[PDB]
Amino acid sequence: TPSPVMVLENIEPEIVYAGYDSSKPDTAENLLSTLNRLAGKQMIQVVKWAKVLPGFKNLPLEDQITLIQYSWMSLLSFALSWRSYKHTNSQFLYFAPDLVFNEEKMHQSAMYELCQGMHQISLQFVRLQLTFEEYTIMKVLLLLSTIPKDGLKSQAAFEEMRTNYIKELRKMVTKCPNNSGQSWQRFYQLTKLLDSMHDLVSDLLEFCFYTFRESHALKVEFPAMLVEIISDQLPKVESGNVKPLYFHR
Numbered sequence: 001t002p003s004p005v006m007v008l009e010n011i012e013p014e015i016v017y018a019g020y021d022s023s024k025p026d027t028a029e030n031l032l033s034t035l036n037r038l039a040g041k042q043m044i045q046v047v048k049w050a051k052v053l054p055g056f057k058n059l060p061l062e063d064q065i066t067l068i069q070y071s072w073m074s075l076l077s078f079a080l081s082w083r084s085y086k087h088t089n090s091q092f093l094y095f096a097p098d099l100v101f102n103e104e105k106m107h108q109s110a111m112y113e114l115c116q117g118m119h120q121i122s123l124q125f126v127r128l129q130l131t132f133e134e135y136t137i138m139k140v141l142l143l144l145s146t147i148p149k150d151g152l153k154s155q156a157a158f159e160e161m162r163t164n165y166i167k168e169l170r171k172m173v174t175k176c177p178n179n180s181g182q183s184w185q186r187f188y189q190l191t192k193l194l195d196s197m198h199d200l201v202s203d204l205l206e207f208c209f210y211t212f213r214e215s216h217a218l219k220v221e222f223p224a225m226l227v228e229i230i231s232d233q234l235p236k237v238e239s240g241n242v243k244p245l246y247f248h249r
């Protein structure tokens with residue numbers, strides 16, 4: 001019988017291409033539209049992953065949908081950091097095999113400072129020597145990191161799943177012989193890193209919401225997957241119905 005961690009490895013989405021077109025100039029509009037398509041492709045993968053994620057099907061369907069919509073940018077950003085760490089040792093932002101950002105591309109995107117904040121997370125992966133198992137568990141914790149302020153359908157089911165994944169991370173870190181003598185300190189660094197995702201993700205979402213609302217005027221394209229997510233989520237955000245959960249705040 002596979003452990004949850006073994007299942008997480010099996011269900012982890014494969015890396016996809018962005019469809020970067022070298023025949024078009026690296027204008028901000030072209031780069032952002034490409035990123036938005038890549039995010040749409042990856043969000044379809046996230047939905048398929050969530051279907052087979054241990055424990056998730058035990059939450060009401062409406063809560064599963066809510067949680068994906070409340071965490072999508074965090075999930076995608078955390079995966080971006082992992083790819084950047086694994087494939088470039090965090091020298092570059094590895095969006096896809098056909099879309100790798102250096103500083104020039106960060107400027108060309110019109111999102112330099114946001115990209116720099118993402119790069120800082122990937123540098124923390126190097127500092128920590130984050131493992132794949134830590135990454136997969138942490139990604140589930142990000143799915144469970146932001147909730148409506150006016151309630152999920154099942155508080156009980158959500159708390160059970162979140163508690164279970166916190167315990168998975170704690171057990172993995174504190175039982176690993178590589179961490180002996182320092183494992184609780186490592187656990188707290190990992191949970192502080194999770195908390196820091198809220199800061200970055202809020203900033204990413206604010207800019208994405210801006211270009212979404214001004215999409216036609218700015219000539220920034222969005223795929224239907226993102227139109228669905230953002231059209232559902234933005235009224236909830238504007239209403240104030242968002243509670244980021246922190247380990248240390």
Ligand SMILES: Cc1nn(CC(F)(F)CO)c(-c2ccc(F)cc2)c1-c1ccc2c(c1)NC(=O)CO2
Nearest residue numbers: 032038039042076077080114115118204207208211
């Ligand atoms: C939609 C989206 N997804 N990801 C993650 C991804 F890996 F690139 C694709 O799945 C990002 C992203 C980009 C750069 C980062 F450093 C970190 C995260 C964005 C993103 C953030 C802000 C945006 C826009 C996109 N689009 C816009 O039009 C203006 O605002």
